Amino acid sequence: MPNLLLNPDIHGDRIIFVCCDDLWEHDLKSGSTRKIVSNLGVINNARFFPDGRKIAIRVMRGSSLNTADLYFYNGENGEIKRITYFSGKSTGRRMFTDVAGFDPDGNLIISTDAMQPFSSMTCLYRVENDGINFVPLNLGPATHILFADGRRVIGRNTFELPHWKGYRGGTRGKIWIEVNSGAFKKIVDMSTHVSSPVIVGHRIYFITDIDGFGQIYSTDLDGKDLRKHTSFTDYYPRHLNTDGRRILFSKGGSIYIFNPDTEKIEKIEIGDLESPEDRIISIPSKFAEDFSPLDGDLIAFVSRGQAFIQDVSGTYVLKVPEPLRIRYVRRGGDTKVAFIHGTREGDFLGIYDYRTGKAEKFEENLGNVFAMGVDRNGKFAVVANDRFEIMTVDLETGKPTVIERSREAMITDFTISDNSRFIAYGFPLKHGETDGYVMQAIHVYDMEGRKIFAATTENSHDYAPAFDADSKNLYYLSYRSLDPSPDRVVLNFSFEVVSKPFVIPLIPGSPNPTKLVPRSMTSEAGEYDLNDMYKRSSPINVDPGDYRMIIPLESSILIYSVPVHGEFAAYYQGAPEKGVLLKYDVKTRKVTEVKNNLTDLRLSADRKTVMVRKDDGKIYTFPLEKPEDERTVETDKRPLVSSIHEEFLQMYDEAWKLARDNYWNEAVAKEISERIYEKYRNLVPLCKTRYDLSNVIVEMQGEYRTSHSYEMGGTFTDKDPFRSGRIACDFKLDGDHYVVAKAYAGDYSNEGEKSPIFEYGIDPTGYLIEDIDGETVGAGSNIYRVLSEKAGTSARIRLSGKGGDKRDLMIDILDDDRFIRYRSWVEANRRYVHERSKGTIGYIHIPDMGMMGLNEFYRLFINESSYQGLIVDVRFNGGGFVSQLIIEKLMNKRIGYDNPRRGTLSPYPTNSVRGKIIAITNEYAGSDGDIFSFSFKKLGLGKLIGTRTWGGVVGITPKRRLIDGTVLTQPEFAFWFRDAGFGVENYGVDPDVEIEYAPHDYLSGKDPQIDYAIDALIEELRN
């Protein structure tokens, strides 16, 4: 039972490497191995200092390893010490805030975006006094820095990209070298991605897969005389490191040594290191999903692939006796439940009687199931799969029967009548293959006659069907009540409150029950007749809103409502959508609130019990008759038990299967998947930690050689995330005191765009920071650590100005100041553009194509679009999906003006740019950011300046998480441009004028890209 060994470094005969998230050291001479540091969190990189006495360590914390900071380990006394308190953001594909190199004096050089407006701006800083102070090198964003013959060697984006083999986009690693004390030249720019550069003798060694597989190559300090030193075919080499004589690297779980002199490669024999306990315990609530009410006031819930039946207090718990991956569990009978069990082959329907203990599984492979319901009489279930089919499955024979199949999307929204005769569902459809909108009509399946009926027309979005208890009327919701709401900032309107419930009597002649037509004035009777029922449709008298569920009751109707809200939090912070349960009294048409702060709602089969999840994250239950009697469902009294190796294999297979099944090109998917299956599955048994598993799943994901193959979420450690305290200020150690080198502020009147100190009436720039909460900070007291310890609270800060000015203030210590740094960067560029253009050119930056992109675009568009020229900066754009919306605005042509008796001219359209436009982009703009850059040029909006974009345009829409919560992504939607085809993928967008942003440019304090854009526009504006 060997371990997965990774990321080594070497010094003499001593090699250090990672195993089980901890740092180990192996001595080649004695052959002994030892763990030198552990329990710090997940370590992914360790670097010896030049004299090999100390080691710089990068460690990640937070369940998903979303935070990182650095530590120093002293081999002499075994002293461990945290050096950075930045709580740098981290992702599997961009593990930032790390060791960049060591200068000629032996000082540590780090790379970090902690104090920058963008995560891609991983700037270089010399670390002084063990983290007391950080000195910027001003060489621009970089990953590695090497020093040879007195000059600086810079590696840009040279970190490994295991998730994207064959990457050839604009962000590929490149190497630059200094040629004259402050002048730099790009010496290594290959078609593919260069990573892990090191120097031995006078050659730069690095990795790249230009020939089809990862190998070690080398060039001279001029980027010439390319050489190939390896011919690996099993697994890609990774993480080169050197002591100046020999090179170390990891490959497929083993550590190897490359001797440049002999070109000899030798594997290091390390043997079995650690075998932790396989059987683990987990907190059920941390991986819970699919909670549902059962008879007898019992409840069912799924967690980490396991299912349970328990009382509400979680004291009497029964585990469903089925192996890994039960996806859904649903009430089947008095003491019975139906469930979906998944395997490597697909999903299957099963039944379990918790009273008798008899559990049965049917062999009919239903595909990949995303919804399942059971009729009230427990005779059949209804299932929906990714084939876009909705079917019934006889709970006795297991025989499935496809009801219908959509060609647009899954039929996950369905309901079954209490008498088990009708099945109503939303049917996604399109009039034509290339329609921009998918419509959805409710269809009704009559078990008797097996014939489908259209409940509603195909013109909009009808959903959430629900039959009344007597199975005589079909209620549902529609987004048909069109009525626009005005944008309060931009000239725009949108349909915000257009949801309305409708009802269809299943028996012709019978009226809308909510109309209260006197019974004596209605000729009753009539047999069921589902023909032309859409013509009989009638709305219920409820104000339009945004409803998601309708529950018809005897003399009232419950409705799940969602107040209008902003999307920022749900989009970036996973914040759940908040809703309220409303009660509509049919008799008086009076609407009241039943429950609020909801995020989900399940309804008992008999309509007597209601289960909800609230914004507080807890599950509650209450009688629909007396919502005051609410109880809290407890699931953590009983620990979740499982086997790491059983789960890892299950997880590898599912990751592997998802990558195959969701890859945009089906033909390709089959060949790729089969070719890589065993190669990586064979490494799974070497994995002992979730991080190990990650190293294996990601390399397999990279074999698809396509963008967007991500691994997000999951639980890798129990360590709380690192903390960082900020006040939007940069500190410089001057003598024995810290001085505020810079105090950030964007728009003073906006919220959260400035150092909290500004609210006290002074600009802290140039002030000395004497102490925080009575503790002196300075030469002998790390201010970053002090701020970290106060993060999220208000502390007394003593400031000293040049003179006799002294300040004693209670300052809010923020947990982050990225947005303040960003807005300040934006406003600075804005003033600079106005100043250099002499007031003729406007400026706008678009950070991404999501909700932030929309905010920042309009934030400046309303003030910047009416200058003679306009610069649209999309550098560092993180992508999203609103590129098309912003383009639509820039495409407006000013063709007129209103002339008022009083006031000034009003342009028409209001949203039109007045003059010439120019766009700036760089290698850090990507995805939807690629599409914007390509479209800007294609539509002739203006010239495109900068450097080639990221080149990743195969979108993702994840719909499944691993049992531990991990969200994997699969490049499932390949973008195709008219004329260019799929060619943007793995390449990017070339600007009309390429303007590099070299290290010497950063050294001189000049932004050549913005300067060219301003100048080019000034030129164009001459005539």
Give the separation between CA 843 and CA 869, rounded to whole angstroms: 9
The SS3 assignment for 759 reads helix
Tell which one of 129, 275, 597, 1004 touches its own copies (CB under 8 A).
275
Cβ distance 311 to 331 under 8 Å? no
Q: 742-781: which residues touch its own copies (CB under 8 A)?
A: 773-774
Pairing between strand 347-353 and 359-361? antiparallel
Only one residue has tokens 């909009």, namely 460
> Using the rule CB under 8 A, is 567 a contact of its own copies?
no
Q: Is 163 a catalytic residue?
A: no
> Using the rule CB under 8 A, is 39 a contact of its own copies?
yes
> Using the rule CB under 8 A, is 130 a contact of its own copies?
no
The SS3 assignment for 400 reads strand
Task: Please choose, out of 30-38, 257-265, 748-756, 855-863, the segment that lies near its own copies by the rule CB under 8 A.
Answer: 30-38
Closest CA to 944 of 987, 995, 979: 995
- 255 assigned ligand-binding residue: no
E runs forming strands in 511-636: 538-539, 547-552, 556-561, 579-585, 590-603, 609-614, 619-623, 631-632
Q: Which of 144, 239, 443, 708 is catalytic?
A: 708
Tell which one of 12, 13, 35, 566 touches its own copies (CB under 8 A).
35
Task: Please choose, out of 77-85, 171-179, 294-302, 459-467, the segment that lies near its own copies by the rule CB under 8 A.
Answer: 77-85
- 813 assigned ligand-binding residue: no
Question: ∠ at Cα 648 (644, 650), nearest 5°?
Answer: 120
**Torsion-angle region of 196 (φ positive above 0: left; ψ -120 to 50: alpha; else: beta):** left
Residue number, 281 or 525, with CB nearest to its own copies: 281
Residue number, 201 or 792, with CB nearest to its own copies: 792
Cis-peptide into 909, omega within 30 deg: yes
> Using the rule CB under 8 A, is 189 a contact of its own copies?
no
Tell which one of 273, 302, 533, 998 touches its own copies (CB under 8 A).
273
Closest CA to 503 of 474, 532, 524, 526: 474
Task: Please choose, out of 206-214, 454-462, 489-497, 637-645, the segment that lies near its own copies by the rule CB under 8 A.
Answer: 637-645
Would you state the torsion angle of the CA atoms of residues 1000, 1005, 1009, 1012, taken in this order, to the nearest 10 degrees?
Answer: -110
Q: Is 408 a catalytic residue?
A: no
Tell which one of 12, 53, 79, 360 touches its own copies (CB under 8 A).
79
Q: How far is the CB of 618 from its own copies (least distance, A)?
A: 18
The SS3 assignment for 80 reads strand
What track of x and - describes contact with its own copies for positions 432 through 461 (by CB under 8 A)? ------------------------------
What track of x and - describes contact with its own copies for positions 330 through 369 (by CB under 8 A)? ---------------------------x------------
Residue number, 273 or 423, with CB nearest to its own copies: 273
Contacts with its own copies: how many residues (CB under 8 A)?
A: 47
> Using the rule CB under 8 A, is 794 a contact of its own copies?
yes
Task: Please choose, out of 634-642, 657-665, 666-674, 862-870, the segment that lies near its own copies by the rule CB under 8 A.
Answer: 634-642
Tell which one of 12, 13, 53, 81 touches its own copies (CB under 8 A).
81
Tell which one of 4, 795, 841, 945 touches its own copies (CB under 8 A).
795
Q: 828-867: which residues touch its own copies (CB under 8 A)?
A: none
**DSSP per-residue letters across 959-1015:** --B-TTS-EE----EE--BTTTBTTTTTT----SEE----HHHHHHT--HHHHHHHH
> Using the rule CB under 8 A, is 938 a contact of its own copies?
no
Residue number, 324 or 390, with CB nearest to its own copies: 324
> Using the rule CB under 8 A, is 314 a contact of its own copies?
yes
Q: What is the CA radius of gyration of the chain?
A: 32
End-to-end CA distance of the chain: 75
Tell which one of 34, 358, 450, 675 touches its own copies (CB under 8 A).
34
Give the separation between CA 147 and CA 521, rounded to whole angstroms: 95
Burial of 472 (0-12, 13-18, 19+ CB in 10 A): middle
Tell which one of 93, 638, 705, 807 touches its own copies (CB under 8 A).
638
Cβ distance 508 to 526 under 8 Å? yes
> Using the rule CB under 8 A, is 569 a contact of its own copies?
no
Q: Is 985 a catalytic residue?
A: yes
> Using the rule CB under 8 A, is 202 a contact of its own copies?
no
Burial 318-354 (b: 16+ CB within 10 A, else e): eebebebbbbbbbbbbeebbbbbbbeeebbbbbbbeb
Q: For 837-974, where are the alpha helices, taking DSSP H only?
A: 851-864, 883-890, 928-938
Cβ distance 241 to 248 under 8 Å? yes
Cβ distance 305 to 650 under 8 Å? yes
- 903 assigned ligand-binding residue: no
> Using the rule CB under 8 A, is 14 a contact of its own copies?
no
Task: Please choose, out of 574-582, 635-643, 667-675, 751-759, the segment that lies near its own copies by the rule CB under 8 A.
Answer: 635-643
Q: Which of 250, 927, 933, 935 is catalytic?
A: 927
> Using the rule CB under 8 A, is 38 a contact of its own copies?
yes
The SS3 assignment for 87 reads coil
**What number of CA atoms fall less than 13 Å from residue 194's CA on the CB side?**
25
What track of x and - describes contact with its own copies for positions 466 through 505 (by CB under 8 A)? ----------------------------------------
Tell which one of 276, 449, 761, 803 touches its own copies (CB under 8 A).
276
Task: Please choose, out of 26-34, 55-63, 298-306, 608-616, the segment that lies near its own copies by the rule CB under 8 A.
Answer: 26-34
Structure tokens at 526: 């009539």
Residue set of the binding site for substrate? 878-880, 955-957
Contact residues toward its own copies (CB under 8 A) are: 1, 30, 32, 34-35, 38-39, 74, 76-82, 272-277, 279, 281, 314-319, 321, 357, 637-639, 641, 773-774, 785, 789-790, 792-796, 808, 810
Residue ranges of the binding site: 878-880, 955-957
Catalytic residue list? 708, 927, 985
